[PDB]
Amino acid sequence: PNPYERGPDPTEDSIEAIRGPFSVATERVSSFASGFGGGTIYYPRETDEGTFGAVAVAPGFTASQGSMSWYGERVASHGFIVFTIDTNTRLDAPGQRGRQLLAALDYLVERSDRKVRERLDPNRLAVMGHAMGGGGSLEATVMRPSLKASIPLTPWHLDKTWGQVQVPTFIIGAELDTIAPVSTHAKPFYESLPSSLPKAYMELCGATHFAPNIPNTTIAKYVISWLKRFVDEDTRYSQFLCPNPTDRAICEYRSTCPYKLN
Ligand SMILES: [Ca+2]
Ligand SMILES: [Cl-]
C-alpha cells in the first residue's frame, strides 16, 4: 500500500472544510534562526498514522507570515507540516526568497523541535509562496529539484523561462491582478514549464493580487489536493485535480492531466 496516505478517503467537502481530520499544534521559530526570518510551524498532533511531509510558505514583498497565516491551520489540519516563514528583510527579492524557503526547510529537518522532528519525513518537502514568494517558490525548485511540490500563488518574477523545472508546480493566478498580471507572469511561467511536468494553472475569476492573503476555499481545496497528490503520492486526490476543475470561481484552468504515477 501507499505508506504516506493520511486521513479518511477524501470528499469534496473534506477538501473544502476549514478544519480537516487532524488537530494542529504550533511552534514559534524566532527570527534569529539562521538563513531566514523565523516563522510558525503548524503540525498535526496525531502521530499514530506516521510522519508527515512539510511545506514552507513564503510571503510577498514588504509582507510577513501574517499575510499567509490562514494556510497554517487550514493545510496542516489535513496532514502536513506547514511552515509560514518571515524573510530576512521585508524587501528581499524572489531569488532571496527561494534560498530562505530552503533555509527554513533545512531548519525543519536539521534544527526543529523533537515535537516537530519526530513527526517529519525529511524526504517529502514542498514550497509555496505569494507573489515574489511565488517566484521564490519557482527559484526554490530550480535550486532543490528533489522538492515534491511547488505552488506559486499570484507569482511575480522578472525571469519568465522555467524550462528545466522538475518539481510538480501548481500556479494560481488572479484574474484582475495588475501588480503581477497573469498575462506577463503567471501564464508565461506556467507555459514555459516543461510540457512533461505535472503542472496546473488555476485562474480565479475577479480576484486581486492579494486574494491568496484572504481565506479562499477554491485555493485551499486544490492546494490541499496538490499537496496530497505529490507530497503524499496520494492518488485518492487525483480525482479533484484531473480532469480540470470546473469551479465557478475558476476563470481558466490549464494542466498536464492526467498525472500518471511515477
Ligand atoms: Ca535569521
Ligand atoms: Cl521573533
Side-chain angles (χ1 to χ4, degrees), residues 30-38 86-88 100 111:
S30 145
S31 50
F32 297 126
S34 174
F36 65 112
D86 284 323
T87 47
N88 283 325
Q100 306 183 22
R111 305 163 85 210

mmCIF file with all atom_site columns, all heavy atoms in Angstrom, residues 30-38 86-88 100 111, ligand 1:
data_model
loop_
_atom_site.group_PDB
_atom_site.id
_atom_site.type_symbol
_atom_site.label_atom_id
_atom_site.label_alt_id
_atom_site.label_comp_id
_atom_site.label_asym_id
_atom_site.label_entity_id
_atom_site.label_seq_id
_atom_site.pdbx_PDB_ins_code
_atom_site.Cartn_x
_atom_site.Cartn_y
_atom_site.Cartn_z
_atom_site.occupancy
_atom_site.B_iso_or_equiv
_atom_site.pdbx_formal_charge
_atom_site.auth_seq_id
_atom_site.auth_comp_id
_atom_site.auth_asym_id
_atom_site.auth_atom_id
_atom_site.pdbx_PDB_model_num
ATOM   1   N  N   . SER A 1 30  ? 11.963 31.679 16.287 1.00 0.00 ? 30  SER A N   1
ATOM   2   C  CA  . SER A 1 30  ? 12.452 33.045 16.394 1.00 0.00 ? 30  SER A CA  1
ATOM   3   C  C   . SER A 1 30  ? 13.228 33.445 15.144 1.00 0.00 ? 30  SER A C   1
ATOM   4   O  O   . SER A 1 30  ? 13.895 32.624 14.508 1.00 0.00 ? 30  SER A O   1
ATOM   5   C  CB  . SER A 1 30  ? 13.328 33.198 17.637 1.00 0.00 ? 30  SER A CB  1
ATOM   6   O  OG  . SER A 1 30  ? 14.397 34.098 17.404 1.00 0.00 ? 30  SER A OG  1
ATOM   7   N  N   . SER A 1 31  ? 13.137 34.733 14.801 1.00 0.00 ? 31  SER A N   1
ATOM   8   C  CA  . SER A 1 31  ? 13.746 35.244 13.578 1.00 0.00 ? 31  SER A CA  1
ATOM   9   C  C   . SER A 1 31  ? 15.265 35.136 13.582 1.00 0.00 ? 31  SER A C   1
ATOM   10  O  O   . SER A 1 31  ? 15.876 35.161 12.506 1.00 0.00 ? 31  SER A O   1
ATOM   11  C  CB  . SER A 1 31  ? 13.328 36.698 13.358 1.00 0.00 ? 31  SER A CB  1
ATOM   12  O  OG  . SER A 1 31  ? 13.536 37.467 14.530 1.00 0.00 ? 31  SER A OG  1
ATOM   13  N  N   . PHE A 1 32  ? 15.887 35.014 14.754 1.00 0.00 ? 32  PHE A N   1
ATOM   14  C  CA  . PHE A 1 32  ? 17.332 34.843 14.819 1.00 0.00 ? 32  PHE A CA  1
ATOM   15  C  C   . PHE A 1 32  ? 17.784 33.479 14.319 1.00 0.00 ? 32  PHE A C   1
ATOM   16  O  O   . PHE A 1 32  ? 18.992 33.215 14.308 1.00 0.00 ? 32  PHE A O   1
ATOM   17  C  CB  . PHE A 1 32  ? 17.815 35.074 16.249 1.00 0.00 ? 32  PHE A CB  1
ATOM   18  C  CG  . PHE A 1 32  ? 17.561 36.467 16.744 1.00 0.00 ? 32  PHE A CG  1
ATOM   19  C  CD1 . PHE A 1 32  ? 16.872 36.683 17.923 1.00 0.00 ? 32  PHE A CD1 1
ATOM   20  C  CD2 . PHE A 1 32  ? 17.982 37.563 16.010 1.00 0.00 ? 32  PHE A CD2 1
ATOM   21  C  CE1 . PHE A 1 32  ? 16.624 37.967 18.371 1.00 0.00 ? 32  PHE A CE1 1
ATOM   22  C  CE2 . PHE A 1 32  ? 17.738 38.850 16.456 1.00 0.00 ? 32  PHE A CE2 1
ATOM   23  C  CZ  . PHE A 1 32  ? 17.058 39.050 17.639 1.00 0.00 ? 32  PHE A CZ  1
ATOM   24  N  N   . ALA A 1 33  ? 16.851 32.613 13.923 1.00 0.00 ? 33  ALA A N   1
ATOM   25  C  CA  . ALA A 1 33  ? 17.210 31.394 13.216 1.00 0.00 ? 33  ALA A CA  1
ATOM   26  C  C   . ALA A 1 33  ? 17.979 31.748 11.954 1.00 0.00 ? 33  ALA A C   1
ATOM   27  O  O   . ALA A 1 33  ? 17.639 32.702 11.248 1.00 0.00 ? 33  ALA A O   1
ATOM   28  C  CB  . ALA A 1 33  ? 15.959 30.588 12.867 1.00 0.00 ? 33  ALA A CB  1
ATOM   29  N  N   . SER A 1 34  ? 19.027 30.978 11.676 1.00 0.00 ? 34  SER A N   1
ATOM   30  C  CA  . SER A 1 34  ? 19.930 31.310 10.583 1.00 0.00 ? 34  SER A CA  1
ATOM   31  C  C   . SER A 1 34  ? 19.288 30.998 9.236  1.00 0.00 ? 34  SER A C   1
ATOM   32  O  O   . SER A 1 34  ? 18.663 29.948 9.054  1.00 0.00 ? 34  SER A O   1
ATOM   33  C  CB  . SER A 1 34  ? 21.244 30.540 10.729 1.00 0.00 ? 34  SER A CB  1
ATOM   34  O  OG  . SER A 1 34  ? 22.079 30.752 9.602  1.00 0.00 ? 34  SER A OG  1
ATOM   35  N  N   . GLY A 1 35  ? 19.434 31.929 8.291  1.00 0.00 ? 35  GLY A N   1
ATOM   36  C  CA  . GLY A 1 35  ? 19.038 31.716 6.920  1.00 0.00 ? 35  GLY A CA  1
ATOM   37  C  C   . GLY A 1 35  ? 17.689 32.292 6.535  1.00 0.00 ? 35  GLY A C   1
ATOM   38  O  O   . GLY A 1 35  ? 17.416 32.439 5.338  1.00 0.00 ? 35  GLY A O   1
ATOM   39  N  N   . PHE A 1 36  ? 16.840 32.611 7.507  1.00 0.00 ? 36  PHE A N   1
ATOM   40  C  CA  . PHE A 1 36  ? 15.527 33.179 7.227  1.00 0.00 ? 36  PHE A CA  1
ATOM   41  C  C   . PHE A 1 36  ? 15.073 33.953 8.461  1.00 0.00 ? 36  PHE A C   1
ATOM   42  O  O   . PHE A 1 36  ? 15.821 34.090 9.436  1.00 0.00 ? 36  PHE A O   1
ATOM   43  C  CB  . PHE A 1 36  ? 14.533 32.088 6.802  1.00 0.00 ? 36  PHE A CB  1
ATOM   44  C  CG  . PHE A 1 36  ? 14.229 31.073 7.870  1.00 0.00 ? 36  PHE A CG  1
ATOM   45  C  CD1 . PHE A 1 36  ? 12.970 31.017 8.445  1.00 0.00 ? 36  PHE A CD1 1
ATOM   46  C  CD2 . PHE A 1 36  ? 15.186 30.154 8.278  1.00 0.00 ? 36  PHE A CD2 1
ATOM   47  C  CE1 . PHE A 1 36  ? 12.678 30.081 9.419  1.00 0.00 ? 36  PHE A CE1 1
ATOM   48  C  CE2 . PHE A 1 36  ? 14.900 29.217 9.254  1.00 0.00 ? 36  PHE A CE2 1
ATOM   49  C  CZ  . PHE A 1 36  ? 13.643 29.181 9.824  1.00 0.00 ? 36  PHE A CZ  1
ATOM   50  N  N   . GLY A 1 37  ? 13.847 34.470 8.414  1.00 0.00 ? 37  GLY A N   1
ATOM   51  C  CA  . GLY A 1 37  ? 13.357 35.335 9.470  1.00 0.00 ? 37  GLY A CA  1
ATOM   52  C  C   . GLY A 1 37  ? 12.425 34.660 10.453 1.00 0.00 ? 37  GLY A C   1
ATOM   53  O  O   . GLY A 1 37  ? 11.538 35.310 11.014 1.00 0.00 ? 37  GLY A O   1
ATOM   54  N  N   . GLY A 1 38  ? 12.623 33.365 10.688 1.00 0.00 ? 38  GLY A N   1
ATOM   55  C  CA  . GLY A 1 38  ? 11.747 32.637 11.581 1.00 0.00 ? 38  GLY A CA  1
ATOM   56  C  C   . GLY A 1 38  ? 10.385 32.384 10.956 1.00 0.00 ? 38  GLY A C   1
ATOM   57  O  O   . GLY A 1 38  ? 10.165 32.569 9.757  1.00 0.00 ? 38  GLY A O   1
ATOM   58  N  N   . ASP A 1 86  ? 8.887  34.165 7.858  1.00 0.00 ? 86  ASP A N   1
ATOM   59  C  CA  . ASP A 1 86  ? 9.259  35.531 7.533  1.00 0.00 ? 86  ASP A CA  1
ATOM   60  C  C   . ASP A 1 86  ? 10.553 35.517 6.732  1.00 0.00 ? 86  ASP A C   1
ATOM   61  O  O   . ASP A 1 86  ? 11.325 34.556 6.775  1.00 0.00 ? 86  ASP A O   1
ATOM   62  C  CB  . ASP A 1 86  ? 9.440  36.371 8.800  1.00 0.00 ? 86  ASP A CB  1
ATOM   63  C  CG  . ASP A 1 86  ? 8.125  36.768 9.428  1.00 0.00 ? 86  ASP A CG  1
ATOM   64  O  OD1 . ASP A 1 86  ? 7.169  37.044 8.675  1.00 0.00 ? 86  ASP A OD1 1
ATOM   65  O  OD2 . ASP A 1 86  ? 8.047  36.802 10.674 1.00 0.00 ? 86  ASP A OD2 1
ATOM   66  N  N   . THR A 1 87  ? 10.784 36.592 5.993  1.00 0.00 ? 87  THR A N   1
ATOM   67  C  CA  . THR A 1 87  ? 12.029 36.755 5.262  1.00 0.00 ? 87  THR A CA  1
ATOM   68  C  C   . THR A 1 87  ? 13.010 37.595 6.074  1.00 0.00 ? 87  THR A C   1
ATOM   69  O  O   . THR A 1 87  ? 12.629 38.312 7.003  1.00 0.00 ? 87  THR A O   1
ATOM   70  C  CB  . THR A 1 87  ? 11.784 37.391 3.891  1.00 0.00 ? 87  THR A CB  1
ATOM   71  O  OG1 . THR A 1 87  ? 10.926 38.529 4.031  1.00 0.00 ? 87  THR A OG1 1
ATOM   72  C  CG2 . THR A 1 87  ? 11.134 36.384 2.951  1.00 0.00 ? 87  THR A CG2 1
ATOM   73  N  N   . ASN A 1 88  ? 14.293 37.478 5.717  1.00 0.00 ? 88  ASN A N   1
ATOM   74  C  CA  . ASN A 1 88  ? 15.343 38.183 6.449  1.00 0.00 ? 88  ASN A CA  1
ATOM   75  C  C   . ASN A 1 88  ? 15.055 39.676 6.525  1.00 0.00 ? 88  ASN A C   1
ATOM   76  O  O   . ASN A 1 88  ? 15.151 40.288 7.595  1.00 0.00 ? 88  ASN A O   1
ATOM   77  C  CB  . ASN A 1 88  ? 16.700 37.924 5.794  1.00 0.00 ? 88  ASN A CB  1
ATOM   78  C  CG  . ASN A 1 88  ? 17.257 36.555 6.132  1.00 0.00 ? 88  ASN A CG  1
ATOM   79  O  OD1 . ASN A 1 88  ? 17.068 36.053 7.239  1.00 0.00 ? 88  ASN A OD1 1
ATOM   80  N  ND2 . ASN A 1 88  ? 17.947 35.945 5.177  1.00 0.00 ? 88  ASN A ND2 1
ATOM   81  N  N   . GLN A 1 100 ? 15.645 31.251 1.251  1.00 0.00 ? 100 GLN A N   1
ATOM   82  C  CA  . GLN A 1 100 ? 15.108 31.237 2.605  1.00 0.00 ? 100 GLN A CA  1
ATOM   83  C  C   . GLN A 1 100 ? 13.973 30.233 2.764  1.00 0.00 ? 100 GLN A C   1
ATOM   84  O  O   . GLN A 1 100 ? 13.722 29.763 3.880  1.00 0.00 ? 100 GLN A O   1
ATOM   85  C  CB  . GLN A 1 100 ? 14.657 32.644 2.989  1.00 0.00 ? 100 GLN A CB  1
ATOM   86  C  CG  . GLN A 1 100 ? 15.759 33.681 2.795  1.00 0.00 ? 100 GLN A CG  1
ATOM   87  C  CD  . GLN A 1 100 ? 15.358 35.069 3.246  1.00 0.00 ? 100 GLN A CD  1
ATOM   88  O  OE1 . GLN A 1 100 ? 14.444 35.229 4.051  1.00 0.00 ? 100 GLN A OE1 1
ATOM   89  N  NE2 . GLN A 1 100 ? 16.043 36.083 2.728  1.00 0.00 ? 100 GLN A NE2 1
ATOM   90  N  N   . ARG A 1 111 ? 17.147 21.304 12.646 1.00 0.00 ? 111 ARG A N   1
ATOM   91  C  CA  . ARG A 1 111 ? 17.213 22.050 13.897 1.00 0.00 ? 111 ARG A CA  1
ATOM   92  C  C   . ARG A 1 111 ? 15.902 22.168 14.666 1.00 0.00 ? 111 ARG A C   1
ATOM   93  O  O   . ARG A 1 111 ? 15.924 22.694 15.784 1.00 0.00 ? 111 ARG A O   1
ATOM   94  C  CB  . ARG A 1 111 ? 17.742 23.472 13.642 1.00 0.00 ? 111 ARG A CB  1
ATOM   95  C  CG  . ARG A 1 111 ? 19.078 23.534 12.916 1.00 0.00 ? 111 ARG A CG  1
ATOM   96  C  CD  . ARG A 1 111 ? 19.316 24.924 12.333 1.00 0.00 ? 111 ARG A CD  1
ATOM   97  N  NE  . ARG A 1 111 ? 19.904 25.851 13.294 1.00 0.00 ? 111 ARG A NE  1
ATOM   98  C  CZ  . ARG A 1 111 ? 19.699 27.161 13.293 1.00 0.00 ? 111 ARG A CZ  1
ATOM   99  N  NH1 . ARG A 1 111 ? 18.871 27.731 12.433 1.00 0.00 ? 111 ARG A NH1 1
ATOM   100 N  NH2 . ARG A 1 111 ? 20.332 27.919 14.184 1.00 0.00 ? 111 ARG A NH2 1
HETATM 101 CA CA  . CA  B 2 .   ? 17.527 34.983 10.796 1.00 0.00 ? 1   CA  B CA  1
#
